[PDB]
Amino acid sequence: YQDVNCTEVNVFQTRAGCLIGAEHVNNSYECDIPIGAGICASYQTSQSIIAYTMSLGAENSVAYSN
Amino acid sequence: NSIAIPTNFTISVTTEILPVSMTKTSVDCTMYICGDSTECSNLLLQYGSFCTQLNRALTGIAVEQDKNTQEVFAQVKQIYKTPPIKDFGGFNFSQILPDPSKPSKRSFIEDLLFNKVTKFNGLTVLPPLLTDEMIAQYTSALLAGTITSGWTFGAGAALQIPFAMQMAYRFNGIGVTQNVLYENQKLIANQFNSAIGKIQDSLSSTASALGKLQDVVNQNAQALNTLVKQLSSNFGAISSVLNDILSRLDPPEAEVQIDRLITGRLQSLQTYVTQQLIRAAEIRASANLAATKMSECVLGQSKRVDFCGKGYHLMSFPQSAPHGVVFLHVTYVPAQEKNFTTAPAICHDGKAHFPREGVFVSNGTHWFVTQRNFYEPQIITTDNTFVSGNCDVVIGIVNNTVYDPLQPELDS
Amino acid sequence: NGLTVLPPLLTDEMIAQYTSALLAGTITSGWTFGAGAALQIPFAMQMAYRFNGIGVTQNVLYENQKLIANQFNSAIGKIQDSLSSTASALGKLQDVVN
Amino acid sequence: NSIAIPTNFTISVTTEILPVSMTKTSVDCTMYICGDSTECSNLLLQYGS
Amino acid sequence: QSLQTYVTQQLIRAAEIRASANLAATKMSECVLGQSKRVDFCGKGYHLM
Numbered sequence: 001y002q003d004v005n006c007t008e009v010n011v012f013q014t015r016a017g018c019l020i021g022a023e024h025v026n027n028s029y030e031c032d033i034p035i036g037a038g039i040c041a042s043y044q045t046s047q048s049i050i051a052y053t054m055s056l057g058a059e060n061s062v063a064y065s066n
Numbered sequence: 067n068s069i070a071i072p073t074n075f076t077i078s079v080t081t082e083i084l085p086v087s088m089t090k091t092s093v094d095c096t097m098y099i100c101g102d103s104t105e106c107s108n109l110l111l112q113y114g115s116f117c118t119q120l121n122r123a124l125t126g127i128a129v130e131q132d133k134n135t136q137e138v139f140a141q142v143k144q145i146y147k148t149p150p151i152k153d154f155g156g157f158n159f160s161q162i163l164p165d166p167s168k169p170s171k172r173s174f175i176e177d178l179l180f181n182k183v184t185k186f187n188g189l190t191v192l193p194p195l196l197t198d199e200m201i202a203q204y205t206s207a208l209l210a211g212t213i214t215s216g217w218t219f220g221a222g223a224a225l226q227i228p229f230a231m232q233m234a235y236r237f238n239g240i241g242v243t244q245n246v247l248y249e250n251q252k253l254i255a256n257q258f259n260s261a262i263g264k265i266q267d268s269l270s271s272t273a274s275a276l277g278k279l280q281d282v283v284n285q286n287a288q289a290l291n292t293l294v295k296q297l298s299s300n301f302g303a304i305s306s307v308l309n310d311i312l313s314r315l316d317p318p319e320a321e322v323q324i325d326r327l328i329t330g331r332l333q334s335l336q337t338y339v340t341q342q343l344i345r346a347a348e349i350r351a352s353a354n355l356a357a358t359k360m361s362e363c364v365l366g367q368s369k370r371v372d373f374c375g376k377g378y379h380l381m382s383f384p385q386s387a388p389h390g391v392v393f394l395h396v397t398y399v400p401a402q403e404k405n406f407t408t409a410p411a412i413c414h415d416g417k418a419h420f421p422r423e424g425v426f427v428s429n430g431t432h433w434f435v436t437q438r439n440f441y442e443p444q445i446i447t448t449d450n451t452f453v454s455g456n457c458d459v460v461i462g463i464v465n466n467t468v469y470d471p472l473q474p475e476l477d478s
Numbered sequence: 479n480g481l482t483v484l485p486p487l488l489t490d491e492m493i494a495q496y497t498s499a500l501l502a503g504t505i506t507s508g509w510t511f512g513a514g515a516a517l518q519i520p521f522a523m524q525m526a527y528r529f530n531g532i533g534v535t536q537n538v539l540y541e542n543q544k545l546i547a548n549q550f551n552s553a554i555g556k557i558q559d560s561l562s563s564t565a566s567a568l569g570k571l572q573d574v575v576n
Numbered sequence: 577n578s579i580a581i582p583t584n585f586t587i588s589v590t591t592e593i594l595p596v597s598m599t600k601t602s603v604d605c606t607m608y609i610c611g612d613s614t615e616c617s618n619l620l621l622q623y624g625s
Numbered sequence: 626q627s628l629q630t631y632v633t634q635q636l637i638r639a640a641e642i643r644a645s646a647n648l649a650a651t652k653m654s655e656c657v658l659g660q661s662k663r664v665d666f667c668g669k670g671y672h673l674m
C-alpha cells in the first residue's frame with residue numbers, strides 16, 4: 001500500500017508504504033522482487049513470501065599493506 | 067628542428083557531474099481526470115485503453131530509473147573497505163572516504179554535494195530501490211577497491227598493492243617512467259592533497275557546480291506543476307471543477323461538459339507522459355555514459371582523450387550525489403617546458419640510430435635522449451637506441467656519438 | 479505564421495576560427511594541445527610518434543618519408559574530386575536540412 | 577605454419593560527415609494557432625498552458 | 626494538436642542530433658586531439674590522425 005501508514009489500512013513497515021502478507025526477515029539476501037527504499041521480497045523459507053533489506057554483495061576487507 | 071619537452075608537472079583534479087536518475091513519478095490517470103466521480107469515470111471508459119496505457123508508460127520509466135542507478139553504481143561484486151591504517155604513501159583520501167561519525171556513512175565531499183542539490187490529484191512519487199545509504203556503500207566499495215587494489219578488482223579479485231606502486235603503473239600508462247613518481251613522490255602526494263582541498267572549496271561556494279543535477283530536478287518539478295495547473299482549465303466547459311458541473315446539471319447536459327474536461331485532461335496527461343519519456347531517454351543516455359565511465363575510468367585507466375578530464379588520465383574516484391554521480395578525475399598535466407633542438411636520428415659510424423623510447427634533444431652543446439612527457443636527459447648509448455639503415459636516408463639526421471657500455475669493460 | 483529561425487551563437491566564420499585552431503594545433507603540436515598547452519614538435523617527428531601508436535616501427539616513416547608525404551597529399555587531392563563531383567557525399571547534412 | 581606480413585602501406589584519408597546541430601526554429605504558437613484575432617485568442621486561453 | 630505533433634517530432638529529432646553532436650564531440654576529442662586505438666572508430670585502417 002504505497003504512501004499509506006499501516007494505521008490507514010502479517011505486516012512489515014517500509015519507507016515505500018505498508019507491506020501486508022510478507023514475513024519480515026532480519027537477514028539480507030540479493031534482490032529478487034524489488035519493493036523500494038532497499039527492501040526486496042522473495043518466496044523462501046514451509047514456504048512463504050519474505051521481505052528483507054537487500055544485500056549489496058559479500059563484504060570484504062582487501063588485505064592492503066604498504 | 068625544435069621540440070618542447072616538459073620539465074615539470076602538476077597533478078590536477080577535476081570534477082565531472084552526470085545525472086543518473088530522475089524522480090520516479092506515478093500518475094493515476096483515472097483519479098487525475100475524474101477525481102472521485104462515478105459519472106466522469108464511466109465516460110472516461112469510453113476512451114478504452116487511453117488511460118491505462120499512460121499508467122504503463124510511466125511505470126516503464128519508473129522501472130528503468132532503478133536500472134540506471136544499478137548499472138552505474140553496482141559494478142562491484144563485493145563491498146570493499148579500506149584498512150584502519152591509512153598508509154597510502156602520503157596520499158590523503160580522508161575527504162573522499164566515508165565518515166564513520168555520520169548517521170549515513172558518506173564522505174565529506176559527498177555531504178557537500180547533497181547539501182547543494184535541492185499532490186492529492188493522483189500524483190505520487192515512488193522511492194528509489196537503492197537508498198542514499200546504499201549508494202554510499204557502493205561508492206565506498208568502488209573507492210576502497212580503487213585505492214587498495216587498483217584495477218585488479220575490476221577484472222577479477224582485488225589484489226592488494228602499495229598505493230605508491232599503483233601510482234607507478236598509472237604513470238607508466240601515460241608514458242612517464244615510474245622512477246619519476248618515486249623520485250617525486252612527496253611532490254605528487256602534496257599536489258594531490260592540495261587538489262582535493264580545492265575541490266571542496268569550489269563545491270562549497272559555487273552553487274552552479276551542480277547545475278546538471280539541479281536542472282533535472284527543476285525540469286521534473288516544472289512538468290508536474292504544469293500538469294497540476296491544467297486541472298484549473300475549463301477547456302470549453304462551464305467550469306474546471308467537476309463537482310460544480312455535476313451539482314448543477316442533469317446527466318444529459320452534464321455529460322457534455324464533462325466530455326470537454328475529459329478531453330482536455332486526457333490530452334494533458336498524454337503531453338506530460340510524452341515529455342517524460344523523451345526526458346527519460348536523455349537521462350538514460352547520461353546514465354549509460356556514467357556507467358561507461360565508471361568501468362573505463364574508476365575501475366581501469368583511460369587512454370581515451372578527455373574522456374576522464376583534460377590531461378593524461380591517472381585514476382578517478384566516484385562520489386554520490388542526489389540523482390547522479392560525481393567523478394573526481396585525477397590527471398597528469400605537463401606544467402613547465404623548455405625549447406630543445408631535436409633530430410629524428412643520430413649518425414655514429416654511418417649507421418642511423420633511432421631512440422627505442424623518447425626523443426633526441428640538444429641543449430646547444432650536447433645530445434641526449436629523453437622521455438617525451440618529461441625532461442630527463444640521458445647519455446645516448448646503444449642501450450637507448452636501435453640501428454636501422456644508414457645516414458644517407460633520414461632527413462634531418464645529425465652527427466653525434468653513441469656510447470657503447472661494453473667498450474670500457476673490454477678496454478680495461 | 480509565428481514561425482522564425484534564430485541564428486546560431488557561433489557564426490560560420492567563428493566555427494572556421496575554431497576548426498583552424500584545432501587544425502593549427504593538430505599540425506604544429508600533435509595531441510599535446512589536448513593535454514596541456516601546445517608543445518611544438520616537427521611534423522616528421524609527430525607522424526613518427528603516430529606510427530609507433532599503430533605499432534609500426536618509426537624508421538618505417540623516415541625511410542619512406544617522401545612516399546608517405548606524397549600519399550597524404552594525393553589522398554587529400556581525391557577529397558576535392560569526391561566533394562566537387564558528387565553532391566550525394568553530403569547526404570547526412572542535406573537529410574537533416576530536408 | 578603460415579603468416580602473411582604486409583610489405584607496403586597505403587595512407588588513406590576518409591571523409592566522415594556528421595550532423596552537429598539543426599536549424600534553431602522557434603514558433604510563436606499564439607500567432608500560429610490564432611493569428612491577429614482577439615476572439616480566437618480568448619478561446620485559446622481556455623487551454624491553459 | 627498539429628503544433629504538438631511538430632514539437633514532439635522536433636524533440637525526438639533533436640535527441641537524434643544531440644546523440645550525433647556527442648558522437649562528433651567524442652570523435653573530435655579522441656581522433657583530432659589524440660590518436661585512437663579504437664578499431665574502425667576513425668574509418669578503415671589503423672588510425673594516424
Ligand SMILES: *[C@@H]1O[C@H](CO)[C@@H](O[C@@H]2O[C@H](CO)[C@@H](O)[C@H](O)[C@H]2NC(C)=O)[C@H](O)[C@H]1NC(C)=O
Nearest residue numbers: 073074075076250252253254256257260401402
Ligand atoms: C616543480 O614545481 C613545484 C611547484 O609546483 C616546485 O616545488 C616548489 O618549490 C619552491 C621553491 O622553488 C617552494 O617554495 C614551493 O613551496 C614548492 N612547492 C611544492 C608544492 O612543493 C618543484 O621544486 C619544481 N620542480 C622542479 C624540478 O623544477
Ligand SMILES: *[C@@H]1O[C@H](CO)[C@@H](O[C@@H]2O[C@H](CO)[C@@H](O)[C@H](O)[C@H]2NC(C)=O)[C@H](O)[C@H]1NC(C)=O
Nearest residue numbers: 152153154156157158159160161174259262263
Ligand atoms: C588529511 O587532511 C586532513 C585535513 O583535511 C587532516 O586533518 C586535520 O588535522 C589537523 C591536525 O594536524 C587538525 O587540526 C584539523 O582540524 C584536521 N582537519 C580535519 C578536517 O579533520 C588529516 O590529519 C590528514 N591526514 C593525513 C594522514 O595526513
Ligand SMILES: *[C@@H]1O[C@H](CO)[C@@H](O[C@@H]2O[C@H](CO)[C@@H](O)[C@H](O)[C@H]2NC(C)=O)[C@H](O)[C@H]1NC(C)=O
Nearest residue numbers: 412413414415416417457458462463464465466
Ligand atoms: C657528418 O659526418 C660525416 C663524416 O663522418 C660527414 O661526411 C663528409 O661529407 C663531405 C661533403 O660531402 C665530404 O667532403 C667529406 O669527405 C665527408 N667525410 C668523410 C669522413 O667521409 C658529413 O658531412 C657530416 N654531416 C654534417 C651535417 O655535419
Ligand SMILES: *[C@@H]1O[C@H](CO)[C@@H](O)[C@H](O)[C@H]1NC(C)=O
Nearest residue numbers: 068070071402403404405406
Ligand atoms: C621557445 O622559443 C619561442 C620563440 O618565439 C619563445 O617565444 C618561447 O617562449 C620559447 N619557450 C621557452 C620554454 O623558452
